Design an enzyme around this catalytic site. Sequence first.
Site, PDB file in Angstrom:
ATOM      1  N   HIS A 176      62.866 102.781  71.577  1.00  0.00           N
ATOM      2  CA  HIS A 176      63.606 101.503  71.660  1.00  0.00           C
ATOM      3  C   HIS A 176      65.032 101.789  72.106  1.00  0.00           C
ATOM      4  CE1 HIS A 176      64.992  97.625  70.732  1.00  0.00           C
ATOM      5  NE2 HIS A 176      65.209  97.790  69.422  1.00  0.00           N
ATOM      6  N   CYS A 215      80.926  87.585  70.380  1.00  0.00           N
ATOM      7  CA  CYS A 215      80.395  86.575  69.415  1.00  0.00           C
ATOM      8  C   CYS A 215      79.210  87.143  68.619  1.00  0.00           C
ATOM      9  CB  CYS A 215      79.930  85.295  70.094  1.00  0.00           C
ATOM     10  SG  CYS A 215      81.293  84.344  70.815  1.00  0.00           S
TER      11      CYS A 215
END
Length: 384
Positions: free
Chosen positions: A331, A82
């Site tokens: 990150h 999704c």
Amino acid sequence: NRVFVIGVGMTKFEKPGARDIDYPDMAKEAGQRALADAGIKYSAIQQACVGYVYGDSTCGQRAIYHSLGLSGIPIINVNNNCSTGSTALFMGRQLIQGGLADCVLALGFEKMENPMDKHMEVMINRYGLAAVPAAPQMFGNAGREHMEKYGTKPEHFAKVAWKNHKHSTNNPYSQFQDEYSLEQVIDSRKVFEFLTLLQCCPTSDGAGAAVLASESFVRRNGLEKKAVEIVAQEMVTDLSTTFEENSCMKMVGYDMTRLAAERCYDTAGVKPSDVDVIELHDCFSANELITYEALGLCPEGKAGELIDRGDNTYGGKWVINPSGGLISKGHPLGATGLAQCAELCWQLRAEAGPRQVPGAKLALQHNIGLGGAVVVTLYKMGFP
């Protein structure tokens, strides 16, 4: 149902390819550190929530079985098809708070691999930035909007990045641990507009982990000492607005941060001035600077004054990113929230060593979900 973080662990975050281990060994190092910290049997883990972006749907299971051994437990991948995924910690908190489990492992890891969008895609690859091609343009636009409206200077953005690199000198888990001069931040390679390479988060490979538990699990096992309570946690998705109200700052999530934080403050019965220590999502210096105002640390347009007072570092009102932030740590997409959680838990437990914020009692985390939503979390010791 109250939720507690009872153990944390992470790998060092390193340049992709610096360390010759694959993602299951990274997961094992972080996961076994969190389980050792927690002081529980591996069999106590009832479900695992696993955050990662790269690789197929089996990597979560592969990492968990390599870390814990084979078992029948649910292994939930955060990043569903999704594209509305949250974070491993957020989902683990949901399972505890919803009474679906008593004890869960949150695990995250990443092991890498118009003409302006093409140029940024190449720049991201060659400079090793942890960004999608649109992101430097969107954050540069938001920064420029703040300068034009409020009189913020380009140097205020550079000072935010400078402060993060200065903090990183005391974080042995950070990819970068060196203090740069303010002039070096300003003079580093141009990324977009005022944003230079030392104001942008690099890619890191690494893993993080946290053991979450219910109040009954903590009581039954005598684990009050290290139990860090999640006293509020809110996710806010894109806020549908009109042409007339939209802005470059809103397009990078300013109002999602603002509403997530307001809801946390209300739930926990605290104010921004009560927060002692913050880990926030400094993907770019521009995101940190506007996030000061979204979190309500200072009024609209006053971030430059907060920066110039040093109210974002030691001896000031808030210590922001004692870790060195994403700007220094890098990150690894699936692991960033769990590294933020590890540092804030160490801060509240008075175990953050050379980074310790003296007397810290309330911690705020700001992070972005794998689907782009903003998540704000407040932490306090569970049993002070």
